[PDB]
Predict the structure.
Amino acid sequence: MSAEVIHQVEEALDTDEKEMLLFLCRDVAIDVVPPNVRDLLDILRERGKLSVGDLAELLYRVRRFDLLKRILKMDRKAVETHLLRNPHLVSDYRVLMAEIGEDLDKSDVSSLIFLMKDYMGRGSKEKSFLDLVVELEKLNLVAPDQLDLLEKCLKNIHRIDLKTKIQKYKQSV
Amino acid sequence: MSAEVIHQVEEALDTDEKEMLLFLCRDVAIDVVPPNVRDLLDILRERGKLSVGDLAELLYRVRRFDLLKRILKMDRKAVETHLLRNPHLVSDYRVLMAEIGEDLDKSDVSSLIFLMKDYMSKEKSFLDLVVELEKLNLVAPDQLDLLEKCLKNIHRIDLKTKIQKYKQS
Amino acid sequence: MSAEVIHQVEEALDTDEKEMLLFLCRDVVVPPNVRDLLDILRERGKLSVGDLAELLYRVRRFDLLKRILKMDRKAVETHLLRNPHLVSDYRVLMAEIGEDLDKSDVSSLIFLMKDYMGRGKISKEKSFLDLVVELEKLNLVAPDQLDLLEKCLKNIHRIDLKTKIQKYKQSV
Amino acid sequence: DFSRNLYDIGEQLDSEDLASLKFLSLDYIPQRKQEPIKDALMLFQRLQEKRMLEESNLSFLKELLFRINRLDLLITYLNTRKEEMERELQTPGRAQISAYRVMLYQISEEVSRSELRSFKGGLQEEISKCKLDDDMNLLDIFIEMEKRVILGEGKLDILKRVCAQINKSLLKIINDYEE
Amino acid sequence: DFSRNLYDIGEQLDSEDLASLKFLSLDYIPQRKQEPIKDALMLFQRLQEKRMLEESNLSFLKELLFRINRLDLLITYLNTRKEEMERELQTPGRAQISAYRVMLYQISEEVSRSELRSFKGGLQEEISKCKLDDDMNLLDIFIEMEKRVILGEGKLDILKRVCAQINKSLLKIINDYEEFS
Amino acid sequence: DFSRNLYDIGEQLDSEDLASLKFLSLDYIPQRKQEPIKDALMLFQRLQEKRMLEESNLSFLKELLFRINRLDLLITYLNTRKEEMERELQTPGRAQISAYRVMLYQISEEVSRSELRSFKGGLQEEISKCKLDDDMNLLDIFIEMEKRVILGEGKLDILKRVCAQINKSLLKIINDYEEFS
Amino acid sequence: DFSRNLYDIGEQLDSEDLASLKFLSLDYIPQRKQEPIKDALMLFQRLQEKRMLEESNLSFLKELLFRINRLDLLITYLNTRKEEMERELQTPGRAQISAYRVMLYQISEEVSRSELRSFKGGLQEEISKCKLDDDMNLLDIFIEMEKRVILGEGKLDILKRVCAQINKSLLKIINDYEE
């Protein structure tokens, strides 16, 4: 990797994709808290966990295929085959959380926050779904082997499709 | 080129024209996300791709000939001749997308989003949808079959004909 | 205890959690940053594995309790039941009240407390714990002096936090 | 394909069909979520979120369309005949809409304009005046009656009184529901 | 001036002509899009969106205007005589409106008030009472029958029964459609 | 769970029920705090902050639901009958909403659209023109009158005048509140 | 006590009332100081900094509350009746707000939504095109007019033109102010 590619990727992404990339990479760099995405990519490079395939996977997870074709000159099926044969940088749990967050508007997030406040404590409340998942991880309330509470809360807000998403994930492990 | 010209233009345009200008200039500044039109024009000027003719073309695409007369002191035929002589900043694909977006109300856009969600928040515009598709490698100057089929399926056959006429160019 | 654990904890926390840890440890020499604070607590003998567990429990970072110290909530609760507390119940109450106030509530609190104090310092934006520290420096809040904060929380219709204060007051 | 089918079914439903469908779905989509539903595609979306409408579960959509008497849509877009729907909905357990809801919709289908005005006159003493305006149909009156627990699966007496004031076939429909 | 010509043509159609046009266009403009059509220009716009109305494709507009017997407007704004429209509409394939829709419109044109009330009485067994109110015309009743698949090109039995209960010329129109189309 | 129950109760309240709830709580939630309340959960949290809504203090929520005639929610989610609430609210001191607020809401429930238009017409000289738009309901008109101290617990004469010009039952409600006060 | 009273008064003002206060205070609080004012307490503290609001000088606060027609706040929190304020503000010298500002606010309170549309349409040639979006109320348009010296104590001609094109009572307000 080189700083030129990282610069192109970081400036090409938008705010939502930057937050999503940071959240997805919370697992590969658990010990540190990267302030921005460029520093995150530099940390991944110095830690050896940012090859061309890793950056391809990261761009694929944020569903930014235009950068896969313009910057890395790769196609969707190439990244999919790379993920099929080589180990994954981002676990399926993070992908599932991002997928659930993609299908929730502001009202759904507010209702989820209301239900979760009894389970976390009153201590903002204008956050995104990924911020809530992060605060829950800090509170040991959600995990790859601990999805029961989020499943129940998604069920109670009539987002049964997301409960089915969690069930398929559980059926994958 | 000078900052006063960019200022007069930015203060003269309205919100819809600003969004349309950003979408049209998505091809020149293909790797940065300008927040407002002043920054977009400043980036075009710093990159050298904002001459007097370039700003004339930009004002022409939003059909603001009054600004072409007041600020740049140009007419319709002059800008058309400049486009006949020099290469275009905005491709005909972007002009086609903007022309299609101008002929869709909110219900048509909602129906397009409904049909396309299988391939892919609310309160989106058509140009926002085209951008989200571009990021997903679903629409391109050489990849209009999905948009053509979806425009047909919502009984906007005139826009399918627009796409056909573009494809025939 | 070892410096590796202290380094893990310091780099794992974020800015707000670091500020809260400093505020909570204000009772136990003023360390400028959190890593120096943890080193001082260890050097004084007041940072065993149980003390760091209590500190992580007060900042509500149970993930660090599980990854770094390999403990859960029940173990740290039993440790707090058996051994004396590093962080007083007053500091926990202050942090708990601070966790339940948005920026508008803090500004309204500052107006009332300002007439009672003057607001001699002008910071960019003061948090609730910063306000409580500035009040402590003026002898306006204490474990035995919660009447002013109680009245100000009443006047902004945050009666739940007033009830928190009163439950604390009845525990002594 | 599947989404295009739903869009085509929606393009044939007018605002009245949408109001009828939303009333038949009151038992699954609450008031607050029903309020912003202004077209059929939004109802289809909120139904998909509840898993009651997918490519492998056309049951609730066929039931909804059959209950509002849109046999044309059933035969055209879902390839389902009237006898098939009768046999399906008459099997114990497969009917997803409650008999109370279907009787309310059918009794609404049998009340004309003058009968609706007389119905509003009959409930002048048990429903507030502003909620008895000319711009309201009978289904909204049923909703407002349920809000005051004077209408329900166990409390049909006030409905029976008003219907006997109106017409006899309405009483027949109520008693046929009684079973 | 095609646009202003369309606006002028729209300014001459009243609510009855608009209802007739909307019924005659049921096979191309769906219910949801037909509901908010409150003037002729909006129906013209919906036709333009389907490319059935352009400056070089006046066929469907001329057919609609000829079928509602607005020959004056046809001669004035589109420069078309009745003889031209007959010669065009009877050439095989050039009729864009279905013969079924045209016979339904003709049957509605031949039903007076008392015959309309009798028709509503005839359909008391297959149509709800609210869908048989006095404020409804015969075309809306045709639509409501089509919704219950009791009326259509292959389902003329109930229409035939009711018309035979009412009048002879209606049945004659039905059979004239049936034999020739 | 208490929070799940509050969420379910909120999912049954539409925007009009929320406006009614916010009007009935004007004496406990001021204007500045009321403005951003756009769903029931925000009002519930404002009440929890004032301790007027807890797992062991359902009094104010039940009173609010009874006053807006949502007996269905009371019987279903809060397990409370109509007779129980009318007997509780008739105990001296246990009514947390003021009789003035309840009388204003009940008098608003008896005014139809045309009567509300006439009501707006009556107040042409003592209320600014922008505060007399069609987008305002009668409760907002009550608020705007309270802002100019022409309506209140001690000033019921102008409300009397307008209501007596409109409808008799409104005057009856006003006087029945006035004596039993 | 005093600070609690100011806080309580601030809790009764919504965003629209706050905008009204900020417009009425244009002659004492400049634009840069006005921009970050998002609640009533900030305007109150800005007045305190100029000593126009203290425990022994409630005059300007009472005037502001009277001019926005919040007589309830005056009578409840400041113990002041309507007649008292009417008698005070019409005594020579005691009026701290200019008559020009009060007439502009009164004209803003008398313009509905459609009248605002037409008013904004009238000024299409004297205001930049982006600054004539729906997101502006009439007071923001007055501010933008004052910035371009087309509206003022001596320049009432354009305001008179637009009002005469719109309504007669607005011209009456202007002429009654002028005398």
Q: What stands out?
A: The longest helix of chain G spans residues 99-109. Chain G touches chain C at residues 2-4, 6-7, 39, 41, 45 (CB under 8 Å). Residues 31 and 108 of chain G are 19 Å apart (CA to CA). Chain G has twelve helices and no strands.
